[PDB]
Amino acid sequence: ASATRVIQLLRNWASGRDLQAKLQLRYQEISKRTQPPPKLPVGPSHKLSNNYYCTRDGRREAMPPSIVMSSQKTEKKAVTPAPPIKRWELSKDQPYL
Amino acid sequence: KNFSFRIDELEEMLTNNRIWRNRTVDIGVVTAEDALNYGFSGVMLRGSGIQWDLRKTQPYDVYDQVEFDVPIGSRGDCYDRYLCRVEEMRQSLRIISQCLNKMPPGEIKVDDAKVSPPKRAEMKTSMESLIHHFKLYTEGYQVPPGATYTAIEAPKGEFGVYLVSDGSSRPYRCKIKAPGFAHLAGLDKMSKGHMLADVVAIIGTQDIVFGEVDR
Amino acid sequence: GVRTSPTGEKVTHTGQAYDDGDYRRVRFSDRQKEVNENFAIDLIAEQPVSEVGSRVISCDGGGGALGHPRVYINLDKETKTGTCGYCGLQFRQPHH
Amino acid sequence: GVLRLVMELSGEMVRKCDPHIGLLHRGTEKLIEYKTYLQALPYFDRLDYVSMMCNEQAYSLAVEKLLNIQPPPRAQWIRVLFGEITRLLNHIMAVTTHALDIG
Amino acid sequence: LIAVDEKLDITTLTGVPEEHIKTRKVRIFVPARNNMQSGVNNTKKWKMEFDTRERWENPLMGWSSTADPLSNLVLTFSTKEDAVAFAEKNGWSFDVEERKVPKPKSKSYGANFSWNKRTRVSTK
Amino acid sequence: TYKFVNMREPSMDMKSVTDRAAQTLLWTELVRGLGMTLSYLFREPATINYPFEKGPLSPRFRGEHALRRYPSGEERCIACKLCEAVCPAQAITIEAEPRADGSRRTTRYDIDMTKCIYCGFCQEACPVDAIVEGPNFEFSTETHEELLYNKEKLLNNGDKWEAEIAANIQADYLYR
Amino acid sequence: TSVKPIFSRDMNEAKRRVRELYRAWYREVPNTVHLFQLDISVKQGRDKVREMFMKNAHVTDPRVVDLLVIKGKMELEETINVWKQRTHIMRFFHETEAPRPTDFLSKFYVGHDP
Amino acid sequence: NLIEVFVDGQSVMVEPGTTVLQACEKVGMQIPRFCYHERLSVAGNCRMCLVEIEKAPKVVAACAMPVMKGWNILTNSEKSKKAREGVMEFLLANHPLDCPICDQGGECDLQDQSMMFGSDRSRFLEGKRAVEDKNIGPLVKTIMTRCIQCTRCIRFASEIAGVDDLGTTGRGNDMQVGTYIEKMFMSELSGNIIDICPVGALTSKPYAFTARPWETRKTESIDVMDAVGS
Amino acid sequence: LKKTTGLVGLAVCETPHERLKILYTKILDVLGQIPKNAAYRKYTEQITNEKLGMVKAEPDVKKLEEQLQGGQIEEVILQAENELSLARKMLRWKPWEPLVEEPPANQWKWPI
Amino acid sequence: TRPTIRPRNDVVHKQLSAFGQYVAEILPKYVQQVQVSCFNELEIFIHPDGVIPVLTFLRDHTNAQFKSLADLTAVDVPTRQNRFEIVYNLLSLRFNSRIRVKTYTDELTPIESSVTVYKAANWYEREIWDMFGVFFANHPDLRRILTDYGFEGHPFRKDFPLSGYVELRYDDEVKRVVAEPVELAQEFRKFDLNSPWEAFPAYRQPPE
């Protein structure tokens, strides 16, 4: 910035942290407003051969929902929608604040 | 780089302030069962203590390739919710750092010109690309018939879309489930035995956006 | 080619001018009528005719991806000149 | 600014709260029904206007799940990065406006 | 489980004004195939649409103004019976047009080359 | 993984009790907040001197609409109505007829700027890059009517901002 | 043919509920006039309530009557709790709408509407 | 009597002499087509209707192939999809980029069938052909660069209008549909060549550039200009 | 032993094993009033017996919680109470009779 | 690998099918149909009178702890006799799963309110009533929630016009806001966008 040395000491002591390292204002450390022209890559389907759309058509592979039980139409174990969720583990980086 | 200091400056003014603790502590306390059943999601559940988060339980996009912690409250009040939000900001900073480190190269849209519009050069040099651009920007791609309910962990909780398609290029039905709707419905439960300022604090900690509430 | 209508009102490039008995001219009182002075038809007529030695010529409007979609024009009929209809540009095959 | 609250108090306590929502209802769902899938994206962009890209991501995920297609990895990483940026925005707004209401 | 023999009249519940309830004649029809295209996927469901009303020009900008709320209202029904039931329970007047399917035709490529018939073509 | 934010029992030893009692009687955290605010007071403000200084923008910025021309002067629009097809707000009204020389050109092109949501779909759908969103954003008016642009107004905007619009399109046409 | 009831098994209970709703609306007109500072008289409010009740007199299905009285109770609840403004109460009285003629000659003169 | 055929494994009874395309119509499947019109003679040249029989090694043209007893028609087979993609690839390879300036834009059978039964990409790196436009009267505007040489206008002209003035002059890729001489195709039924043309090669001159199909509202009425009551 | 269960409003139970045994017994004896052929009775009896055996064969609280895979043992107790209440309600409802009524001909058909 | 096609989870599909069979066997009196979509979503179609028992079972059962009510909405399909389609989305945190329950209902048929089972059902059913006209029998407080006071009609029905029937403006004669019949300066332009060619052969209906 451009503050006086005494002002910098006062602001560092009042805040308790060195504010010169972390400045809210951007001083020439941002990217240039003018950048060189890019060259974007092509996707995986930009192939001149072996690229028939019938083999890579996501929409046409959709199906109507499968009927599991319909009213019109050895013991069995009880089942759940999914295996029970495993309990979370306390983080080792900083378990408590 | 220059944001953790901002978070620390924010915390210096509110976290340990006795006035803020008086205004937020033990106000709007909601139990875990009541929060759930009233239909709560996200920060409300985490403050009440329920270890639930969509980004970790039902990952979407590449959220399963990043490491972050889920803040958990203990008393289920405004102060705990505020602490959870601050820690969520820090964890989002960590996730941003990881994404910046591990950004991959490649294309930015699906290479399927029947869904994603082709590039302008291809459209101006290719007949198929021109036809697909024309059709996509006039009629729109058709979606197979069906109905889906997809929910994500938006910053205010579980934000869900129930989309019903009849096979046309326009959606037949679109229900929008906003997290703030259930929270504002439960506002009356949380405001029992409090005052006007406490009601204001409860609304603030519920973080209601009336745009998403009303739609 | 901005021409003035009988009522003293400028005529736009689309041949628009309110009639004598039209009440809608009141909106221009104490104000002005927005008319673009440059006429695209007049300018494209002022543009010359390019001559190339081929039966089929490709036009993309100039600039590549900044122009219009590339089209091919057949320069066979000597009665007229082949006109790219995106940019309205005339091409011709040498005769004499 | 679009909230109407009917409160029954007992001296100082609050005995009943009734939020009268509906002051910002615009028939977004019916408008979406009348639009196409691409033309309905800004409607989600304008639903929760502190988490705009989060709403866009949710709608995009729904439409992609219906279409049975998959975004490229770079697109997924960009979506996650900007979702986290939008989460920072939303949390900042929430905490700061909470404090602004309380002092 | 009470018993009643009414005709399922929800006119007083729909909230539509009596003018638009009693002065509207809807058309229950299968849309005709667009002659500019050969596809027949738009001629499979019955459509219910209302009668056209006045549309004038805006004095400013010359836009197409209107005063008929039901001008853009088009409903899709699977069967004529369902469409007629909906129209009857909503109380609007209606006229129903029967479906016009294309009749089957006899086509033979060998008929283009006939020894003694007029179906012989002069070109390919 | 997860973590606890407010689960930490303070110690009950005499030293900690005395420290907490001193914090209660002597407003230590309040003094800390005052010091932070004083530091922010002595920091430099982040205010720009508008209108003499302008906030940063990008070539992708969407503002006032404009209709462009070819270098030959012929207008780029070919009356294709993809504008009207793709506009989410239905803010574009287009009417066309063959020109005197037989070209496919518009006779009416109106944009309702009070209905437009400035979403930028119209310039994505243009096959000839005719309609663009110019960088101008200071076109506030004192009446509702002045925001109902027509073909003449849009062509005037294009002629007025052609240099800047062309520069922005040149700078950001490789990403599209 | 056979359907489940809402509130009334037959028309007598529906008529009883209609009478109760009419009593409730009748006893609230002066209070509504006083609270909203309406410029109308109490007699005009009573006549408007009577007119609103009489425009559904042709309903014969008990379920439709039950839904109508439920909606009427909702509207009365909105009025008693002063949730509505003077705006809606006066919206009941079409006051700024021009009188549309109901004769063939006038309808022919004004425009194409039937 | 009626013979039994199979479409995608579903049995259907059809009259003798019925074609694969009509059997698919009976079962509800619409085979893609460019040159086939039910009210015209069969051409079989566009090759867009190629379908696969269950055990046959070569695909057949559904518009001109009578069904045999016991045949199973695989409409959604891999071979059928690849054949449709190839035919559409050829058509769009030689077609011009005129969709925005074309009156057939939103109601084009080439665009719709390209988006349904076609590929989304082009590997054609060569230069396209250009054909000089003809003049056949003030009612029909001809931009013959968009013609796909489907010969619908020739067959319609001959059979329906009794006017044998349209035909194909040339050979190979240079084959052109036209009148050769500058004769104008004038008849009492000359706009139906505008209707039946699947592309914008023949378009209504009075209607040129005025509007787009998605904007217009369709009202079904009858014609009052004579006693036919069309 | 634990100071807090971690959930607001969920108090710590000092005697979890006895409470679990009582709740499981009350669930089992209520299900005796449901017909044996009912599909609901078999599954809930099976799961209750599977969980009841774990309680009787595990004295350690942490090991019992690990075996049950139902989270906190207080959560397990609350789930047992909810299951007992549901069993009573289902006994009142009797949802084992055949279907009340089939839907109309085309009711769930989609798209339509 | 296929980059442009979404992956499929046969394990989750089988688990959802098994749970659907389980619930159908447990509740034969109300469950009419069970479906599993190809993107792994379980749907249960039940009789409208079994809403309370089915929801109570799916909330309190040990293997079916769907404690959270994710959403509650209705879909209007005029062609059906029972046009309204009430949909319940339930979330189970214990097993990390979601379920969908569907119910049919016409204009005049009330439904039992689920406020006893789930508390969000209060406002969700209020919104459903306000927007469609579906009535819930045992609701603590049923009234309009989103629409304006005195609003006539249910906007989300497919037979309700987009712009409504009335509009608001300030009238200087009466010094208040008034409601007058709607009259648009520019009419909404209806676009016919459906293509005349079938796009998905998998969903093709019988020719009837």
Ligand SMILES: CCCCCCCC/C=C/CCCCCCCC(=O)OC[C@H](COP(=O)(O)OCCN)OC(=O)CCCCCCC/C=C/CCCCCCCC
């Ligand atoms: C003029 C110079 C300015 C320099 C200072 C700069 C400005 C500093 C001002 C910042 C203050 C911010 C505003 C403060 C508003 C709130 C103040 C406040 O909260 O104080 C209340 C505070 C605690 O309240 P709670 O914790 O909320 O109650 C819970 C009880 N368990 O109570 C108080 O009374 C504060 C104490 C004030 C008196 C302190 C006396 C200390 C003890 C004196 C011992 C000496 C006795 C003398 C005998 C000596 C024998 C030898």
Ligand SMILES: *P(=O)(O)OCC(C)(C)[C@H](O)C(=O)NCCC(=O)NCCSC(=O)CCCCCCCCCCCCC
């Ligand atoms: P007797 O039983 O013969 O009574 C005669 C009638 C015709 C009422 C019969 O009871 C009868 O058979 N009626 C037909 C069925 C029926 O009861 N219909 C009535 C429907 S209830 C209804 O419509 C009530 C809703 C009206 C709410 C009015 C709102 C008040 C507006 C006030 C505006 C200004 C006030 C300040």
Ligand SMILES: CC(C)NC(=N)NC(=N)Nc1ccc(Cl)cc1
């Ligand atoms: C709907 C959300 C995104 N918006 C906000 N208005 N939250 C809010 N508490 N913000 C705020 C701003 C200024 C004032 Cl004076 C008082 C409150």
Ligand code: SF4
């Ligand atoms: S920016 Fe969007 S809303 Fe505005 S005119 Fe363009 S397409 Fe329409």
Ligand code: SF4
């Ligand atoms: S998209 Fe371009 S060419 Fe088409 S109408 Fe708009 S400005 Fe004109």
Ligand code: SF4
């Ligand atoms: S005929 Fe069809 S494919 Fe050819 S330019 Fe016209 S719209 Fe495009």
Ligand code: SF4
């Ligand atoms: S002009 Fe049209 S109808 Fe005639 S052959 Fe060409 S594409 Fe077919």
Ligand code: FES
């Ligand atoms: S439709 Fe059969 S080959 Fe053309």
Ligand SMILES: [Mg+2]
């Ligand atoms: Mg044509």
Ligand SMILES: [Zn+2]
């Ligand atoms: Zn050109």
